[PDB]
Amino acid sequence: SGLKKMAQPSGCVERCVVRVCYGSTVLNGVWLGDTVTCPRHVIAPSTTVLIDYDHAYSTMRLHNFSVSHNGVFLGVVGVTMHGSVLRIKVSQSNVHTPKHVFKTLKPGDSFNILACYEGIASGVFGVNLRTNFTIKGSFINGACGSPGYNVRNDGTVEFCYLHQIELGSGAHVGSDFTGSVYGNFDDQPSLQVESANLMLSDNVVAFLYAALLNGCRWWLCSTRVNVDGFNEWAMANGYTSVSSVECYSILAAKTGVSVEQLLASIQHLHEGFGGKNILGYSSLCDEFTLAEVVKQMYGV
């Protein structure tokens, strides 16, 4: 029992994080093989005014880099620029490099953030990429370069995020490991305004299934709405569309409650809980994916 937003264990990733200094700017990088990936704004002469990156890159000198792993120096051999990241070739290889790939997130995907400062991990937490290509994180000065990841069943680490931006709203943006900034935000300290966040319908359906399976059923209306009607309502009320009903077949069978009944309940519960709670939450929750709910109720 219970449902809790968790991180996948962080050990394999903790050994990949390094301190990258250029001039007096310090942030984090990710050390895999003999390459350190970091946000390209580390070579900006200032990050408080518009940055001419071509100029900053062509004026850059290697000797201004200082890359270190836990206080141990790491020599810089070369630097290339790829979208919003640098790939810094270094003279030592990371012998703790895990089996890994690079992967780009899509909205609705869960992943893990290892929040780091000056090459050191301080925190780990699960988050979702929102429809507006932001996340809601917790980062202060120094967090840039913190990696996001997922761990596949076989132990393969998918590196999928690199922290870069805090929007004027406080929401957070990164790039992937190719240097594409999520949502095509720009890696500039200019005002950029994200689209309005859409509640992830698929996750809210999962959440309600989790509530049924934990004995919380008071909110259940005896109403049904189909996917097409729900999707139309969702446009008007800040929700995404819902995917295939069949994705939920194991949970529909275990609870006896169809998706369509959950879709109606979301419509009704959107009006508020009336001072009551579901699994302790005072409004609908779109934090958990179906995969997370299944893993936390059954996944062994």
Ligand SMILES: *[C@](O)(C(=O)NCc1ccccc1)[C@H](C[C@@H]1CCNC1=O)NC(=O)[C@H](CC(C)C)NC(=O)/C=C/c1ccccc1
């Ligand atoms: C990131 O550069 C970082 O951690 N840098 C190291 C560092 C910065 C400052 C002092 C010491 C060390 C930060 C991370 C931000 C900072 C606060 N919380 C975070 O997540 N990233 C930035 O400062 C961004 C740099 C850009 C060049 C990409 N700044 C912005 O995203 C600014 C946005 C903005 C400016 C003006 C009006 C609205 C929005």
